[PDB]
Amino acid sequence: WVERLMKTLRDPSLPLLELQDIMTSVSGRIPPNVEKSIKKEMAQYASNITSVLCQFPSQQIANILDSHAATLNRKSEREVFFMNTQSIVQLVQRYRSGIRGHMKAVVMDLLRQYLRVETQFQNGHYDKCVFALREENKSDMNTVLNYIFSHAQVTKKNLLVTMLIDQLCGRDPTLTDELLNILTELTQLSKTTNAKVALRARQVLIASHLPSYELRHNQV
Amino acid sequence: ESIFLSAIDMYGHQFCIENLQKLILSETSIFDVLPNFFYHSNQVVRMAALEVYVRRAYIAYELNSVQHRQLKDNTCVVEFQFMLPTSHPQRMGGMVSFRTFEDFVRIFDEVMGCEPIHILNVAIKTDCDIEDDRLAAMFREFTQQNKATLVDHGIRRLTFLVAFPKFFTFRARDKFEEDRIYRHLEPALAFQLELNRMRNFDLTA
């Protein structure tokens, strides 16, 4: 599942299919101007699949949609346009940073789901965490049970997290100001059961500051 | 060479892209270096070359689509779709590289699978002895026999780029496969010579 997610997210034709699915389900209620612009942009991107100097034109679709919005046509041209284009807005928002940025952001979201669980089992014993969750979630005991149930299988979660980190910050020695925060929080899991996910994370924090052999080879 | 070989380890680091953009959008000639990127070690730089050179050459053309294809060999081809805004009122083309002679003639009909609007260009690694007659005869021997450029879909001109670069343009459609006038000229930069101005003359190069 992880390898297929990785290869799918790296395949440039994925947001093309998402675009086709959102647009084919909405044939009307869209101005022909933005629809034709989107069609031309996606046709170009489709004609330039698997080629250098090619990226998904999320910004151009955002540009034409925001331009038609800036015109702001009133009386059923405003509301219909602003409502029946939200799917394409979400599509460009997901791929605002390209297929590679979306790929990294998905794994970041999975790691954020991990932290969402495990950050409640630090800073206290088991009973302290459970009591604090009951006090925080008085109106529903299902949330606390979900927390405990997720924490039960933390070893399998750790294995999947290691597999995720292997593909997020591997052969790409660079880290942005978002991955670094997730990795920082993940390394502060002092509880020994999560040590596996902390240790590997520290490797990334030290691994992406090394030469790639290209600088030395080329210069020398 | 550094820009071309450094982007091949992993492309999409947001600095090799701008470097290729600088190479395409710069006024300085880089055609004395580009044809030598056959592989040099890597076999991916082929595409990186084939997409830059054309981009560098086709400056008067509105280029709307570039695509990278590969045959089940060590033969990568790049296809282009472009047009002229206000001249001769849609064109297409493609470029491929080969090694020393034979991969060109061997899979010629396959690499062709990208009004005669198609423009086909080819580069071959013969890095020795600038000799117009020998290379011209070598290429003409094949063009005089293989007429796929006319009967497949219709290809206006076939450009033979010898790797400093020597360009031999041929038209195996109606006329004898030879061009002494546009020899050593890039066919997309043939406009940047003011040579079509000699309309009332029979020219001798």
* Resolution of the experimental model, in Å, one decimal: 2.7
Strand partners, B95: B78, B121
Nearest CA among B85, B80, B81, B25 for reference residue B56 = B25
Shortest Cα–Cα distance, A111 to chain B (Å): 23
Q: How far apart are CA B165 and CA B35, in angstroms?
A: 7
CB distance B172 to B180 below 8 Å? no
Q: How far apart are CA A168 and CA A204, in angstroms?
A: 10
* Burial degree of B124 (CB within 10 A; 0-12, 13-18, 19+): buried
E-assigned strand segments in chain B: 62-70, 76-83, 91-98, 118-124, 155-162, 166-170
Judge: B47–A212 Cβ closer than 8 Å, yes or no: no
Interface subset of A 103-162, CB within 8 angstroms of B: none
Strand partners, B63: B82
Shortest Cα–Cα distance, B17 to chain A (Å): 7
Q: How far apart are CA B196 and CA B87, in angstroms?
A: 14
A210 and B CB contact within 8 Å: no
Handedness of CA A142, A148, A151, A156 (dihedral sign): negative
